[PDB]
Short mmCIF file of N, CA, C and O in Angstrom, two decimals:
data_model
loop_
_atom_site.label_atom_id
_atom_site.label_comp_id
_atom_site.label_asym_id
_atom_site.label_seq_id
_atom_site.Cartn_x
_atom_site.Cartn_y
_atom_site.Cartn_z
N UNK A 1 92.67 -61.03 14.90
CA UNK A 1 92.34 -59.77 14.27
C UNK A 1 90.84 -59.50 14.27
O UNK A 1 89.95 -60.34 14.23
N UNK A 2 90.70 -57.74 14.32
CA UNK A 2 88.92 -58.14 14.44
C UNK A 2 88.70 -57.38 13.14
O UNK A 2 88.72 -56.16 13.08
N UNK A 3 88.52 -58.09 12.26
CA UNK A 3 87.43 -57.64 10.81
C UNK A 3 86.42 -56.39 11.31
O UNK A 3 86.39 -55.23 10.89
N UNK A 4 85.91 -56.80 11.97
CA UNK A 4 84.42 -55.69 11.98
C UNK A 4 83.48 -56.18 11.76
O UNK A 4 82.86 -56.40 12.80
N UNK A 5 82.84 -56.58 10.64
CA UNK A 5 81.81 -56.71 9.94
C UNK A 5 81.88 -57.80 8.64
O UNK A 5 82.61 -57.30 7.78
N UNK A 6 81.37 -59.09 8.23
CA UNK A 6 81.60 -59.96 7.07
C UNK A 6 80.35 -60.26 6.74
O UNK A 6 79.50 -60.31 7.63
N UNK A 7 80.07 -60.46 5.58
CA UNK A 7 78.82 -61.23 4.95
C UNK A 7 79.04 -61.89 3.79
O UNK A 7 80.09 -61.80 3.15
N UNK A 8 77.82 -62.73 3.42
CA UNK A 8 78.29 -63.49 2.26
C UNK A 8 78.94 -63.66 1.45
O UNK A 8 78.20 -63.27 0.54
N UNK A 9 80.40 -64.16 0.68
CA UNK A 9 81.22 -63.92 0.27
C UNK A 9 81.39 -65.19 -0.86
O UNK A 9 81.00 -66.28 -0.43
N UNK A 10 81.99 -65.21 -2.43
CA UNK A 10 82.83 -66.27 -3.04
C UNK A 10 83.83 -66.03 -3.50
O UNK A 10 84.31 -64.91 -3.64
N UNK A 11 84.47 -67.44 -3.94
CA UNK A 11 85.62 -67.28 -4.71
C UNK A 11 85.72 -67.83 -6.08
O UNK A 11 85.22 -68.84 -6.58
N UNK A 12 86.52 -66.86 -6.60
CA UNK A 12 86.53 -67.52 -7.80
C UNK A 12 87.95 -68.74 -8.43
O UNK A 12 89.14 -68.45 -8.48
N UNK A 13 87.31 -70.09 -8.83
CA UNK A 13 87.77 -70.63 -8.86
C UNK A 13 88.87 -70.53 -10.48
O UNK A 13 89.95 -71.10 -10.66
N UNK A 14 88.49 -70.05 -10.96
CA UNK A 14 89.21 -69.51 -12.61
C UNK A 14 89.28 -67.91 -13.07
O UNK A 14 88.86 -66.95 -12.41
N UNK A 15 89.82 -67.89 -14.15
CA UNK A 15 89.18 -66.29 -14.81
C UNK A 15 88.32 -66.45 -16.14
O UNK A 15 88.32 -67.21 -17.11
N UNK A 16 87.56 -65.29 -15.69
CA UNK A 16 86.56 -65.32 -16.34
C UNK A 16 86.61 -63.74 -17.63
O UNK A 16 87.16 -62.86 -16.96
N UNK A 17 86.43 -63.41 -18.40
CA UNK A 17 86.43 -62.57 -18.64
C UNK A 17 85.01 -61.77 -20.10
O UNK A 17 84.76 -62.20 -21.23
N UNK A 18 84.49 -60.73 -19.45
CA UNK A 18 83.44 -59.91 -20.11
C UNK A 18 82.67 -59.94 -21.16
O UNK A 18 82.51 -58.78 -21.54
N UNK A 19 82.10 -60.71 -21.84
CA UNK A 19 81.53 -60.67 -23.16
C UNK A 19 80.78 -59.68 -24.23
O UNK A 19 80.92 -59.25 -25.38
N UNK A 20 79.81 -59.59 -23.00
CA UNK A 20 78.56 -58.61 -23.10
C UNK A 20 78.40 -57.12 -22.26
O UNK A 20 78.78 -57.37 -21.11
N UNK A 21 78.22 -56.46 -22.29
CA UNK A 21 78.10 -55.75 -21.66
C UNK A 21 76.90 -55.08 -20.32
O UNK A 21 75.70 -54.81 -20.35
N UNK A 22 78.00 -54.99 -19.21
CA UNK A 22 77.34 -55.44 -17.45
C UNK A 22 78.26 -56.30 -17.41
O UNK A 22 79.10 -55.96 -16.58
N UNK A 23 78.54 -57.39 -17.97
CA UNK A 23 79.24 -58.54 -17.27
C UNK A 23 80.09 -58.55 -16.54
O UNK A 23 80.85 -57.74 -17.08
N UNK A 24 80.77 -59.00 -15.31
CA UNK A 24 81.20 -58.70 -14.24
C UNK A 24 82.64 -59.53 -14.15
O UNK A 24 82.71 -60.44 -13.32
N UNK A 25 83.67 -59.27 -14.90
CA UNK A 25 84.61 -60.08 -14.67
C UNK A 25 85.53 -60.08 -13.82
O UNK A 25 86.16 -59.09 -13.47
N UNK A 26 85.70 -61.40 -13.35
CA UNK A 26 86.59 -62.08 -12.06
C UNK A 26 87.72 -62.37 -12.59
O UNK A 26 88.01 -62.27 -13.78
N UNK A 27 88.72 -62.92 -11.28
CA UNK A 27 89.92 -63.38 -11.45
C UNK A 27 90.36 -64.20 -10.59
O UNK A 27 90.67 -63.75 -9.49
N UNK A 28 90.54 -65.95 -10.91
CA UNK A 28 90.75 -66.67 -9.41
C UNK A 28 91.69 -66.07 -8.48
O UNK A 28 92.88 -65.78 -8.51
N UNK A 29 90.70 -65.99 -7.60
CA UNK A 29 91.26 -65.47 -6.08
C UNK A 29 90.67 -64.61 -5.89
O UNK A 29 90.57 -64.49 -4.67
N UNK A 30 90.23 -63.96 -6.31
CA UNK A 30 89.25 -62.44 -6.46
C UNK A 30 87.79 -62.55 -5.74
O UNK A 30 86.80 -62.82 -6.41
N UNK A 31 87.71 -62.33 -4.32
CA UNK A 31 86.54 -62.15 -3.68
C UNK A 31 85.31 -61.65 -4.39
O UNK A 31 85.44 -60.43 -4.54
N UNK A 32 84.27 -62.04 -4.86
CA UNK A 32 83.35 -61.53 -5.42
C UNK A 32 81.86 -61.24 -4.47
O UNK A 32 81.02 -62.14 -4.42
N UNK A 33 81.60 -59.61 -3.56
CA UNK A 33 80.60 -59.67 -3.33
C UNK A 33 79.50 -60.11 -3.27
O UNK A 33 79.44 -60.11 -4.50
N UNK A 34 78.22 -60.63 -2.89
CA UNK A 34 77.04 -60.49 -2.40
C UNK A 34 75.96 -60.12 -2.46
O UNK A 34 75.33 -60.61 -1.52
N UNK A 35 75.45 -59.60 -2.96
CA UNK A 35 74.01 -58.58 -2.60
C UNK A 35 72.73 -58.98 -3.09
O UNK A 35 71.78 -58.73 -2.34
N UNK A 36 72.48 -59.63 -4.33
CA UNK A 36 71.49 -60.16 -5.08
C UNK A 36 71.48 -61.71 -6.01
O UNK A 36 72.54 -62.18 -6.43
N UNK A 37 70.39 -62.28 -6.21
CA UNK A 37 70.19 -62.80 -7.53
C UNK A 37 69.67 -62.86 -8.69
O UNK A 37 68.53 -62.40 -8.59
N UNK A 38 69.90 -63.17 -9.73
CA UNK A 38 68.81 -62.12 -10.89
C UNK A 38 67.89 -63.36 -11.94
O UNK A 38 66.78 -63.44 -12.46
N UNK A 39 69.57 -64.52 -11.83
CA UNK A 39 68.99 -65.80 -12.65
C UNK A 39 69.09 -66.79 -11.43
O UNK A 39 69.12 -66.50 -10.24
N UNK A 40 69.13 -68.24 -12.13
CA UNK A 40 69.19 -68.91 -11.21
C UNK A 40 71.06 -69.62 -11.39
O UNK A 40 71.67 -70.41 -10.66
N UNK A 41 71.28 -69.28 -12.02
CA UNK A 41 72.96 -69.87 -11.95
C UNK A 41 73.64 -68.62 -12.20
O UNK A 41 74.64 -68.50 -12.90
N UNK A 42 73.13 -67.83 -11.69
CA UNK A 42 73.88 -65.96 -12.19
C UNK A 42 73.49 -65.29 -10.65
O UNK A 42 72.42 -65.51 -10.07
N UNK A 43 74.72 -64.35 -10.06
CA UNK A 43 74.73 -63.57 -9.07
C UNK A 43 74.86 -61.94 -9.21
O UNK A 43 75.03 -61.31 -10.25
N UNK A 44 74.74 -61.45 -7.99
CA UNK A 44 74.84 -60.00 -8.10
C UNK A 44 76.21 -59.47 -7.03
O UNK A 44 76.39 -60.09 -5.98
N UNK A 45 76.73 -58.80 -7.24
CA UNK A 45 77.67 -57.61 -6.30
C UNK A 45 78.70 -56.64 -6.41
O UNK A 45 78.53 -56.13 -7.52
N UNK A 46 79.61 -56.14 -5.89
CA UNK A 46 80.10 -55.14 -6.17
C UNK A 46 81.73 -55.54 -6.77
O UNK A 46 82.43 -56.27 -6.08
N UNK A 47 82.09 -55.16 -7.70
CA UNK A 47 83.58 -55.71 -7.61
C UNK A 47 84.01 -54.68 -8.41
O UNK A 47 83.37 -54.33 -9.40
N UNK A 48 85.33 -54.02 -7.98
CA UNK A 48 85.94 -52.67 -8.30
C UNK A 48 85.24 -51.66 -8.73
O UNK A 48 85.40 -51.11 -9.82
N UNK A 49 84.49 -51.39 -7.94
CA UNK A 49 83.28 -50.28 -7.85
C UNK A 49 82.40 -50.64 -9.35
O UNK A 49 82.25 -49.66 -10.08
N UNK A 50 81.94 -51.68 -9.74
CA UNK A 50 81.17 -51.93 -10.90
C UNK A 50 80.30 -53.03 -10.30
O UNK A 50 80.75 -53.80 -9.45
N UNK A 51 78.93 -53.09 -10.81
CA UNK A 51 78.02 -53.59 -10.39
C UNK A 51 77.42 -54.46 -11.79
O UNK A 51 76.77 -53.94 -12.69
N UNK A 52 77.75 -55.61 -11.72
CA UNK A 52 77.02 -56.70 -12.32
C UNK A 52 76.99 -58.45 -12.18
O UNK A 52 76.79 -59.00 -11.09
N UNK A 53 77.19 -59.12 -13.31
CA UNK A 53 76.13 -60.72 -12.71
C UNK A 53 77.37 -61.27 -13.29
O UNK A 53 78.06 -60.94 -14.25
N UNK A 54 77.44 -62.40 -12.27
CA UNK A 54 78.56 -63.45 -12.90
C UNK A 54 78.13 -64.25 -12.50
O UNK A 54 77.24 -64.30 -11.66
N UNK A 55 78.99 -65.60 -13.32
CA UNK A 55 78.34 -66.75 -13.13
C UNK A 55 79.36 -67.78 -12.23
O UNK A 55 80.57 -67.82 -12.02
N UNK A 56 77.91 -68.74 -11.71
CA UNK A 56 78.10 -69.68 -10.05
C UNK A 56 79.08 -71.01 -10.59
O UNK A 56 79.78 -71.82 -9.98
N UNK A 57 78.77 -70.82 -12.05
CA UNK A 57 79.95 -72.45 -12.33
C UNK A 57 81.37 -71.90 -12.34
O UNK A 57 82.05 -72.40 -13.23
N UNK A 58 81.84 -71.21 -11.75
CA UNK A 58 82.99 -70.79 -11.79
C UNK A 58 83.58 -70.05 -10.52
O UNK A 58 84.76 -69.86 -10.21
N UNK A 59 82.36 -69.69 -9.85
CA UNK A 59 82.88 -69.35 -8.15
C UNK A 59 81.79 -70.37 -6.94
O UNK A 59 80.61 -70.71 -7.02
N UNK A 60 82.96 -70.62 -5.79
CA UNK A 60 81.78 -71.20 -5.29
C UNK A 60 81.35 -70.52 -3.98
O UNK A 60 82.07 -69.69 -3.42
N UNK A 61 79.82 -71.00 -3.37
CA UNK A 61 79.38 -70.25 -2.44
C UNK A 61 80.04 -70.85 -1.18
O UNK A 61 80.13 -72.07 -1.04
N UNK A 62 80.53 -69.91 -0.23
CA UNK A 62 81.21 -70.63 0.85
C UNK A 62 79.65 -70.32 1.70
O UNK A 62 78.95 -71.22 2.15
N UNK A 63 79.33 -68.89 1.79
CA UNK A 63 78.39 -68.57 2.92
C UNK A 63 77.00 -68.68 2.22
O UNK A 63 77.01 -68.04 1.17
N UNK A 64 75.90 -69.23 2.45
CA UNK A 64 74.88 -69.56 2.01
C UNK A 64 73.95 -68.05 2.06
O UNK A 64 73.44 -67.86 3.17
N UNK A 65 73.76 -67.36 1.41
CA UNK A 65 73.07 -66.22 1.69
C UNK A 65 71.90 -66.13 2.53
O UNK A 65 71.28 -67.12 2.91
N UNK A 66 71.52 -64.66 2.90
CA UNK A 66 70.27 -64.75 4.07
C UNK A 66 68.66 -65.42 3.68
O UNK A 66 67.79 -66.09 4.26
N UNK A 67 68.88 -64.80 2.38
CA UNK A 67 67.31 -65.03 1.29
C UNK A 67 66.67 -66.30 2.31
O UNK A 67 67.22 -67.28 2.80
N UNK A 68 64.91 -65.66 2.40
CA UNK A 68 65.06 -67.35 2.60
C UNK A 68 63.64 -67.88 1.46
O UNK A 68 63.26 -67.27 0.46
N UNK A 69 63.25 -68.80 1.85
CA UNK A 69 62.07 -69.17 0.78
C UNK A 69 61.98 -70.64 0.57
O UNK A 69 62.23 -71.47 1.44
N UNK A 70 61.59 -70.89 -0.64
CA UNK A 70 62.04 -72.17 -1.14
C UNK A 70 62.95 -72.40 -2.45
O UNK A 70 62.78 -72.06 -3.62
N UNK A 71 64.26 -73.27 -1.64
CA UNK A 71 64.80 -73.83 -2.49
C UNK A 71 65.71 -75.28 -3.04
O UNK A 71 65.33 -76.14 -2.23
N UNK A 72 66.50 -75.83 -3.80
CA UNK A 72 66.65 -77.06 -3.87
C UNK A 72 66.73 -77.87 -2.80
O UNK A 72 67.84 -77.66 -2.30
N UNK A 73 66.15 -78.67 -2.20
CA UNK A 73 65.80 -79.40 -1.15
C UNK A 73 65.08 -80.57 -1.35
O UNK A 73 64.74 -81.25 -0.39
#
């Protein structure tokens, strides 16, 4: 099959659900976009047309994002 187009992508390994408000809640199995980082154990992307930060102890990174710089190494 040809996709088209893929980029950085996780999964979530549990459910998570909203506390605060922005918070971005998942559901294991639930692909969670890409696009930014804001903390250092907190992400950015799009999920059902809502835009906010969830957290990395609970999804993991399959594709290593483009960013480059310095990091744990």
């Amino acid at each position: 099959g040809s996709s088209g187009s893929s980029g950085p992508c996780c999964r979530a390994l549990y459910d998570f659900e909203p506390e605060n408000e922005g918070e971005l809640g998942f559901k294991e199995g639930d692909i969670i976009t890409l696009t930014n980082q804001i903390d250092e154990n907190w992400y950015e992307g799009m999920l059902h047309g809502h835009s906010g930060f969830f957290p990395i102890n609970y999804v993991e990174i399959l594709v290593a994002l483009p960013h480059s710089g310095p990091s744990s190494g």
